[PDB]
Design a protein around this nucleic acid. Structure first.
Ligand SMILES: [Mg+2]
Ligand SMILES: [Mg+2]
Ligand SMILES: [Mg+2]
Ligand SMILES: [Mg+2]
Ligand SMILES: [Mg+2]
Ligand SMILES: [Mg+2]
Ligand SMILES: [Mg+2]
Ligand SMILES: [Mg+2]
Ligand SMILES: [Mg+2]
Ligand SMILES: [Mg+2]
Ligand SMILES: [Zn+2]
Lengths: 56, 224, 106, 55, 129, 88
RNA sequence: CAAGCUUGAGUCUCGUAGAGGGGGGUAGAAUUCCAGGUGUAGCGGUGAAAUGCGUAGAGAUCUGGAGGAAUACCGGUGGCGAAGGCGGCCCCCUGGACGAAGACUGACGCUCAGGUGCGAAAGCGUGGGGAGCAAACAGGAUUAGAUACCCUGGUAGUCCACGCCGUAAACGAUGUCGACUUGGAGGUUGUGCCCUUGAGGCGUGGCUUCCGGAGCUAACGCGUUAAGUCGACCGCCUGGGGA
C-alpha cells in the first residue's frame, strides 16, 4: 500500500486513502496472524470452521 | 372440466424442477424452462373422478369443508364455498379444529354469542373500548371460524387448495378417516390424499377453475 | 524427442558474447540431431527488480527439440558461465513457432 | 494458452504490490487460476514481474 | 466379488419391490430361471422373460396388491458360506404353510410342498412369503 | 513406464502377432521388462518407497499370471520363464 | 474332470488433472549475525514490572556481506496418496488414478490367520549443520506457596546423510470386495454433441461437500461416498476396577 498525495488534496483525504489501502491490503490482519506460532492442526481446524460458518 | 378448458387457466403450470417431490413422477408431462409441466391427460379423469365422489357425498346430505388459506385465494374459496351451502376455512388453520373439535367448538359458541349479542342483544352501550375490544375478538373469530361456524359436526369430506400448505388439515382428516380431495402441486406429497388432483395450486385463475367446478357439482349433487 | 522452452539472461557487460553463446548452443542441439524451433534475441531489457545490483540485462529466448544429454550440458554450462545471471529451461508438450508476446509488444 | 511471457495479461491478475489476486475477486475458473499462478511465478523468477512493491 | 448370484436375485427382487418398481432385471442363469419359474407358478410375480443369447438378461415382472408388494419377505437360506440340505421328513415350511421354501432336488427346483409330495429332499435355496 | 516402441516390440516377440496384446506370455514379458528397468531406478533411489509399492504390484501381478499359465499349459509356462530367464 | 463363453479381472493405444514418491539445481521475503554511513539516549518487555540490552553508541534508519530454516499472495468443506502424510520455482528418475475408442487374453477373481513391507511426532547411535523456535536448566516476576502459567536467556531437539525405534484421539473413533434401492443444491476433474457465433445450450464417466426421502438406529444421527437391502472372507468384543 504505497500512496502519493495529489495536488490540492487535503492531508486528511490522502490519509483516509492510505488507511483504506491497508484495510484493503490486510497488513494488520497479516501481522496479527504471525505474531505467534500456530500449529498446522490448528490452522486446518480454523479453515474447516470458517468454511462451515460460510454457509448461511 | 376439459383438457382444453384446463390448459387455458394454466392448471398445467407447476413449480420448478428443483422443488419437486419425487412421488409425483407419474403426473408430470415433463419440464420446460426449469419448470415442471403436469400431465393434463392424467389430471382431468382424476379430477372428474374427484367430482363424482363429491357429487355422491353431497347427495346423502354430506358436509363439505373447503380448505384454502393462501392470502391470494382466500376470498375465492369463500364465495366458492358459500355458493353451494357448505363450509370453509380461509385463514390460518387452527391446529385441532377437527381432532380437538370439542374444544374448538366452544369458540364457535363464543362467535355466535358475540355477533348475536352485538346485533339482536345489540348493546352499543359499551364503555367505548368494548365496541372495538369485543369487535376485536369478533373480528378475529370471524376469519378463523366464519366458514365452519354452522358446521355443527365433523365434515364428511375435505376439499383442499395446496396439500403442502394445508398439510395440517389433511393430517387431521387422515386420522379421522375423513376423505381428502386436494389440488396437489408438483412440489407436494400426495400420500395424504385419497383423491389426488394434480395441478397448479397458486394461480388465482387456476384455483378458481377447480373451485368453480367443485362448488357447481355440489349444487348438482344437492339439486338431485 | 522432448521439447523445451529455454530462457537465459546475460550480464549486460557481456552482451557481446551472446551471439557466440547462441551459435554454440545451437550446434550442440543440431549436433545431437535435435531441432531448433524458435529463437528470440530480446536484447537488453529492464528488470522488474534488481538482481546482483543490476537494472537491465540481456535476454535470450529459445524453443528447442533435443535429448537429455545436450539439455543436461546446457543446464550445467549455465551454472558454470558467470555471464548468465539467471536461466530457466522448462519442458513443453509441443513445439512453438509463433512470435512471443515480446516480439509483438515492440 | 496462458504463457508467463504475456506480462500484459498477467498484470490484470496481480495487486498493486504484485500479490496474486484470488479466484474469488477475479472470478476466474479454478483450473486456470492454477495455470495463472504458475505463469506469474515463472514470470517472477525471470524478473518479468516484481515479487513485491518494495523493489 | 459376486459370489452368490442367487442372493443377488432375491435382493434385486426385494429392493425393487420395496421401491415399488414395475420390474427388475439381472444377468440370467438356468438356476435363476428355475427359481423364477417357482415364484411365478406360486403367484409371487407376474411373469418373466430372458432376452439375448450370448449374454442373457433375465427380467421379472413384479406384482402388487393393495398398493402392497405381494412379496412380504424373501430370504436366502442355504448359501456359499453354509450350504443347507434337508431330508424329505425334515423339510421346513414357511408361515405354517402360507409361504413357501424353494427346494432344489434330483428332479429340479420346486417348493417344499412339491418336494414333500414327491418324496424328496434337497438344498434349501430360500423362503418366500 | 515402458516406451510405446519397447512395448510394441515385446508384444511382437511373445504374441501371436502385433495385436495379441493381452496374451499371458505377452503380459508377463511386459511386466518382466519394466521390473528389470526399475531395478536400475531403485538402485539409486532406495528411499522411493511409494514407487516401490508400484513395483511390488508388478511382481505380485506377474506371479499370478505365471501360476495361471502353469496351471493351464505347463509347456507354455516352462518356455516362458526359461525364455525370460526366471526362477533360478 | 474335459472343452468352452465374455459380462468379472487384466493387457494394448492416445490423452487429462494432481502438494503422489526419490534425486539434483535455483529464487525472493524475513529473522539473527558480521562490516560500515547517519544519528543520540534510550531500546526491550509486561496486566504492572524486573532480569536483559545501550554512550566500547544500542534501538531507529540506509548500505554491503555471511548463514540456516521455511516457502506469503495463489489457497479453496481445492487436489494427490494404502495409511502415515505430501505445498516456492525448474529439470531428471518413477508409482497410482481417470476418460475416449476399439483390439487382445479368457474367470487369470474376492478375502486373508501366519509371513513381509510401509508407518506422524518424540526418542536412540555416528558424523555433519545450527538462523528462528524450544523440553532441561539459569535468572526476573506473580502467588499464602508457584518446582507453573507471564518475562529475559537458553542446551538437547527441531535441519542433512546413513542406521535404529514401530507408537498416536495412527479417527470417518465406521475392515476389504461386489450387487441392489427415491431426490435437491454445489465444488473438482475427463469426454460426445450444438448458428463454438456470448463468459453458454443438451448429454456421459471419475472424485468430493452440504441437505434430505424410505429404511435403519437407544437416541444422536446415517441416508446411493449407508450406519439402508444382501452376499464372500478377515480382525475384534463378552460388567467396572485390577491391566
Ligand atoms: Mg537477508
Ligand atoms: Mg504418470
Ligand atoms: Mg477366444
Ligand atoms: Mg540425532
Ligand atoms: Mg521461555
Ligand atoms: Mg542425546
Ligand atoms: Mg494402539
Ligand atoms: Mg444427511
Ligand atoms: Mg428419517
Ligand atoms: Mg472384569
Ligand atoms: Zn404450489
Amino acid at each position: 500500500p504505497v500512496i502519493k498525495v495529489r495536488e490540492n488534496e487535503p492531508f486528511d483525504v490522502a490519509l483516509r486513502r492510505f488507511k483504506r489501502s491497508c484495510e484493503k491490503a490486510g497488513v494488520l490482519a497479516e501481522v496479527r496472524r504471525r505474531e505467534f506460532y500456530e500449529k498446522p492442526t490448528t490452522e486446518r481446524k480454523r479453515a474447516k470452521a470458517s468454511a462451515v460458518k460460510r454457509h448461511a | 372440466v376439459s383438457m382444453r378448458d384446463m390448459l387455458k387457466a394454466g392448471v398445467h403450470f407447476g413449480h420448478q424442477t428443483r422443488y419437486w417431490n419425487p412421488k409425483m413422477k407419474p403426473f408430470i408431462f415433463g419440464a420446460r424452462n426449469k419448470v415442471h409441466i403436469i400431465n393434463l391427460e392424467k389430471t382431468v379423469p382424476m379430477f372428474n373422478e374427484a367430482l363424482a365422489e363429491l357429487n355422491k357425498i353431497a347427495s346423502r346430505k354430506g358436509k363439505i369443508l373447503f380448505v384454502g388459506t393462501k392470502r391470494a385465494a382466500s376470498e375465492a374459496v369463500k364465495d366458492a364455498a358459500l355458493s353451494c351451502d357448505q363450509f370453509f376455512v380461509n385463514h390460518r388453520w387452527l391446529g385441532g379444529m377437527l381432532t380437538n373439535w370439542k374444544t374448538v367448538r366452544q369458540s364457535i359458541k363464543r362467535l355466535k354469542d358475540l355477533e348475536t349479542q352485538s346485533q339482536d342483544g345489540t348493546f352499543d352501550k359499551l364503555t367505548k373500548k368494548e365496541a372495538l375490544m369485543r369487535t376485536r375478538e369478533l373480528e378475529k373469530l370471524e376469519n378463523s371460524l366464519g366458514g365452519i361456524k354452522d358446521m355443527g359436526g365433523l365434515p364428511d369430506a375435505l376439499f383442499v387448495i395446496d396439500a403442502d400448505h394445508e398439510h395440517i388439515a389433511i393430517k387431521e382428516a387422515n386420522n379421522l378417516g375423513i376423505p381428502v380431495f386436494a389440488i396437489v402441486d408438483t412440489n407436494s406429497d400426495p400420500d395424504g390424499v385419497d383423491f389426488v388432483i394434480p395441478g397448479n395450486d397458486d394461480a388465482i385463475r387456476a384455483v378458481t377453475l377447480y373451485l368453480g367446478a367443485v362448488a357447481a357439482t355440489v349444487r348438482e349433487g344437492r339439486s338431485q | 524427442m522432448r521439447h523445451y522452452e529455454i530462457v537465459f539472461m546475460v550480464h549486460p557487460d557481456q552482451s557481446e558474447q551472446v551471439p557466440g553463446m547462441i551459435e554454440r548452443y545451437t550446434a550442440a542441439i543440431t549436433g545431437a540431431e535435435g531441432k531448433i524451433h524458435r529463437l528470440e534475441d530480446w536484447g537488453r531489457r529492464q528488470l522488474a527488480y534488481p538482481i546482483n545490483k543490476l537494472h537491465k540485462a540481456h535476454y535470450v529466448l529459445m524453443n528447442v527439440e533435443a535429448p537429455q544429454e545436450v539439455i543436461d550440458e546446457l543446464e550445467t554450462t549455465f551454472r558454470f558461465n558467470d555471464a548468465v545471471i539467471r536461466s530457466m529451461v522448462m519442458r513443453t508438450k509441443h513445439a512453438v513457432t509463433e512470435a512471443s508476446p515480446m516480439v509483438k509488444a515492440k | 494458452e496462458i504463457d508467463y511471457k504475456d506480462i500484459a495479461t498477467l498484470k490484470n491478475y496481480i495487486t498493486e504490490s504484485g500479490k496474486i489476486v484470488p479466484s474469488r475477486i477475479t472470478g476466474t475458473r479454478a483450473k486456470y487460476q492454477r495455470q495463472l499462478a504458475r505463469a506469474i511465478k515463472r514470470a517472477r523468477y525471470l524478473s518479468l514481474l516484481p515479487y513485491t512493491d518494495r523493489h | 466379488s459376486m459370489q452368490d448370484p442367487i442372493a443377488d436375485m432375491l435382493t434385486r427382487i426385494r429392493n425393487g419391490q420395496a421401491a415399488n418398481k414395475a420390474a427388475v432385471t439381472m444377468p440370467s442363469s438356468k438356476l435363476k430361471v428355475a427359481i423364477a419359474n417357482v415364484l411365478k407358478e406360486e403367484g409371487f410375480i407376474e411373469d418373466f422373460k430372458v432376452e439375448g443369447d450370448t449374454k442373457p438378461e433375465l427380467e421379472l415382472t413384479l406384482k402388487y396388491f393393495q398398493g402392497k408388494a405381494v412379496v412380504e419377505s424373501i430370504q436366502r437360506v442355504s448359501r456359499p458360506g453354509l450350504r443347507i440340505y434337508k431330508r424329505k421328513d425334515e423339510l421346513p415350511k414357511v408361515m405354517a404353510g402360507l409361504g413357501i421354501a424353494v427346494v432344489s432336488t434330483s428332479k429340479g427346483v420346486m417348493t417344499d410342498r412339491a418336494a414333500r409330495q414327491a418324496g424328496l429332499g434337497g438344498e434349501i435355496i430360500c423362503y418366500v412369503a | 513406464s515402458l516406451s510405446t516402441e519397447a512395448t510394441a516390440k515385446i508384444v511382437s516377440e511373445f504374441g501371436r502377432d502385433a495385436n495379441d496384446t493381452g496374451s499371458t506370455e505377452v503380459q508377463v514379458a511386459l511386466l518382466t521388462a519394466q521390473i528389470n528397468h526399475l531395478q536400475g531406478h531403485f538402485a539409486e533411489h532406495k528411499k522411493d518407497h511409494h514407487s516401490r509399492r508400484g513395483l511390488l504390484r508388478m511382481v505380485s501381478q506377474r506371479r499370478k499370471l505365471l501360476d495361471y499359465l502353469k496351471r493351464k499349459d505347463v509347456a507354455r509356462y516352462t518356455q516362458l520363464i526359461e525364455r525370460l530367464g526366471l526362477r533360478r
